[PDB]
Design a binder for this molecule. Structure first.
Ligand SMILES: *CCCCCCOCCOCCNC(=O)c1ccc(C2=C3C=C/C(=N\C)C=C3[Si](C)(C)c3cc(N)ccc32)c(C)c1
Ligand SMILES: [Cl-]
Length: 290
């Protein structure tokens, strides 16, 4: 599994800030937009994109405050990411797109798709954000820590002061051990504690047990849309999984229209790090059917 990131940096000015993005593949045709989550960057797509770039434009931005993008003085609420991602898509002149999305990137992608369905030609997704109505429906192995993350005292001490979301949560979202080189890539945007606000606000935005109500409502809305939409859907899932355990993938396979579910084998949250070969190859095959 490759550890390098051989993509030329590109920057675009968005709402007075610079946003870094990967942009490879042809110039014409429908682009494929890859959206990462927490605490990753476009680095998480590094071994997926090379399967698609031979025949389709691949665009992979770093969310504001993450990766190589600028780090303004913000709270880094989901609403902040929505505003910047909306402007990013406009700044690039994108019309129709195919989405490939993960974790908070899937919240952004599904929310954009719900608001602009005529422009979405397909969605490939994995380990995505859905409403978690109670803590009992959150995976047991992650309950105590995410409950502590969602406080302003201990949660900030863990995530901001001790960088626990990078040194702990990230590696336990991958089945295989991440190498020192790979960890250093993920650590790079957050070496300074003063830059770690996105890592704490994101888990505090997760729609769990009715809080925050605004996020619960928006996620419920895009899940209702997805259940009614004829858009082609490609769902990757693994075992044991984290956000999408095998039982939930099964429920989704049955209920979502026009959906193919693909079992990647062993996987937790960062499925791209455990089976990039299958994920990239399957996306490349699926795009020809859209
Ligand atoms: C959309 C966002 C959702 C992403 C899904 C989450 O992906 C991760 C998968 O779920 C992980 C479940 N993990 C936990 O609940 C958890 C247990 C322990 C710790 C933690 C670790 C973990 C690993 C590690 N290296 C092997 C080191 C630590 Si430390 C820094 C010693 C630690 C200290 C304290 N006080 C608490 C917890 C840990 C974590 C972070 C998560
Ligand atoms: Cl999170």
């Amino acid at each position: 599994i490759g550890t390098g990131f051989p993509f030329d940096p590109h920057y675009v000015e968005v709402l007075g800030e610079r946003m870094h993005y990967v942009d490879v593949g042809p110039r014409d045709g429908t682009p494929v937009l890859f959206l990462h989550g927490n605490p990753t960057s476009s680095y998480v797509w590094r071994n997926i994109i090379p399967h698609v770039a031979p025949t389709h434009r691949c665009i992979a931005p770093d969310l504001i405050g993450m990766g190589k993008s600028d780090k303004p003085d913000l709270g880094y609420f989901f609403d902040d990411h929505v505003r910047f991602m909306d402007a990013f898509i406009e700044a690039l002149g994108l019309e129709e797109v195919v989405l490939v999305i993960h974790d908070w990137g899937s919240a952004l992608g599904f929310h954009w798709a719900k608001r602009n369905p005529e422009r979405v030609k397909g969605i490939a997704f994995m380990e995505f954000i859905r409403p978690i109505p109670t803590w009992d429906e959150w995976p047991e192995f992650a309950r105590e820590t995410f409950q502590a993350f969602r406080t302003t005292d201990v949660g900030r001490k863990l995530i901001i002061d001790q960088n626990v979301f990078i040194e702990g949560t990230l590696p336990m979202g991958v089945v295989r051990p991440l190498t020192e080189v790979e960890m250093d890539h993920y650590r790079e945007p957050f070496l300074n504690p003063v830059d770690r606000e996105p890592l704490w606000r994101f888990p505090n935005e997760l729609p769990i047990a009715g809080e925050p109500a605004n996020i619960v409502a928006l996620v419920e809305e895009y899940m209702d849309w997805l259940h009614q939409s004829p858009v082609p859907k490609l769902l990757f899932w693994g075992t044991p999984g984290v956000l999408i355990p095998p039982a939930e993938a099964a429920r989704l396979a049955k209920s979502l229209p026009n959906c193919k579910a693909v079992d990647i084998g062993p996987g937790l949250n960062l499925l791209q790090e455990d089976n990039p070969d299958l994920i990239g190859s399957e996306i490349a095959r699926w795009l020809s059917t859209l």
